[PDB]
Design a protein around this ligand. Structure first.
Ligand SMILES: [K+]
Ligand SMILES: [K+]
Lengths: 252, 253
């Protein structure tokens, strides 16, 4: 069917503080990416273990179409397993069931364009379990909204407000942090990739997942015009997180 | 008087294209701030012409309390004039009437204590007119949400997502751009200031407006935890822009 919107806080998927979060993020391997494309442990869709995500948020709120509260299970069409992939023991473990999704590809301004690919999956956990992500030297990025002058010329018009990447940090970082889920709770997992080379698909639902590339162009300079169809995807904010029944999401 | 939320696009206040905008911003005078605290032309509240804003967005959508749409004039209590201040001819011109507002002070929780003051005013234009802002070498900033590792140590927990300033640019910039309003249309004006020294008030409503400071600390390093009462103010996003009847907004301090 049609899209529905999430209302409520987005929380870290971790027991102590369940603290709110205000951005989706993406973990970048800058340790072993030269050897071969980075393929690590994490949350993965169905049997496509190459599409690993380290960004999962708990959703304790509710979902609406217009003024009406809706149940993502009732609105669902397709479903598939949301799994944990462990590269150390090569074990794929079912975490829950996907009921909604969204996907988007954002292209930069101007010639020689760059793509951000984003896929979001709304799923309900059916086990209570925890895991740590893998250890490797990393960067981290999220999409930000940037006000900037209109031209290189000194004299600006009304400032542009466009997307850019916050890409951190110069110091060394490892993101081997803990996630914990509770059976029955609702989560969103974000697969976000800057400048990917390859995608994998859940062909039955025409649902894309970009893979982490071995190499990528400068992430600092590019700018993305913010389009109406990028709203709700998680890319530029967590505002108005929007999901579609699986198989009914927009094409990429 | 409870709060209501705006649903719809925020558009540049300019008559060519009315293009959507996705952040509020603040113009910073880095030309003449040493000689005197910068006091330029712009949108000002009532008779407090020192509180000039260059960020006004048109709101063509609707306002809601829950599922019910509301008319901000009907929900209103306090009102005051929203004016244009022209430093060249020293003329204060009434643009419209304020019907709703919001205000907030974001305070850092690190060693260096830093405040961002934000005030928003929802007003209905009563004339159709336009103006340009003043010419001075300037900076520009908006609040951004930044994902970052948890400590200075190598090993991070679940990334923090905090507020920081996008503060641009190294090259020369002037923001003498045009704003244009149409009578009957709804607008929000944002007064946002980093590290202010002074505030002015509409005492009848205990509504604060920070003034542009003569000097300020480094804007790049500070980070602000994003609090629930910062949501809806325009500071970190234009998501769920929230307004209160004038005089019923949250206390500033
Ligand atoms: K690439
Ligand atoms: K100051």
């Amino acid at each position: 069917g049609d899209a529905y919107v999430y209302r409520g806080p987005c929380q870290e998927a971790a027991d102590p503080l369940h603290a709110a979060r205000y951005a989706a993020w993406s973990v970048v391997d800058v340790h072993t990416n030269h050897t071969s494309p980075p393929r690590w442990s994490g949350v993965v869709p169905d049997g496509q273990t190459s599409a690993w995500s380290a960004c999962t948020l708990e959703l304790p709120g509710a979902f609406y179409q217009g003024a009406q509260e809706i149940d993502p299970v009732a609105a669902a069409d397709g479903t598939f397993a949301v799994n944990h992939w462990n590269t150390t023991n090569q074990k794929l473990t079912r975490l829950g069931t996907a009921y909604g999704c969204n996907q988007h590809r954002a292209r930069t301004t101007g010639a020689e364009f760059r793509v951000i690919s984003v896929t979001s999956v709304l799923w309900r956990a059916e086990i209570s379990t925890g895991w740590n992500y893998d250890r490797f030297l990393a960067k981290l990025w999220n999409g930000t909204i940037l006000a900037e002058p209109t031209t290189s010329h000194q004299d600006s018009g009304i400032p542009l407000t466009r997307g850019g990447l916050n890409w951190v940090r110069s110091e060394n970082t490892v993101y081997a942090y803990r996630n914990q889920i509770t059976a029955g709770k609702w989560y969103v997992t974000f697969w976000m990739t800057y400048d990917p080379d390859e995608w994998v698909w859940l062909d039955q639902f025409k649902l894309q997942f970009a893979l982490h590339p071995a190499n990528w162009s400068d992430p600092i300079a590019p700018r993305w015009d913010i389009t109406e169809d990028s709203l709700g995807t998680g890319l530029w904010s967590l505002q108005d997180l929007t999901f579609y029944p699986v198989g009914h999401q927009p094409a990429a």
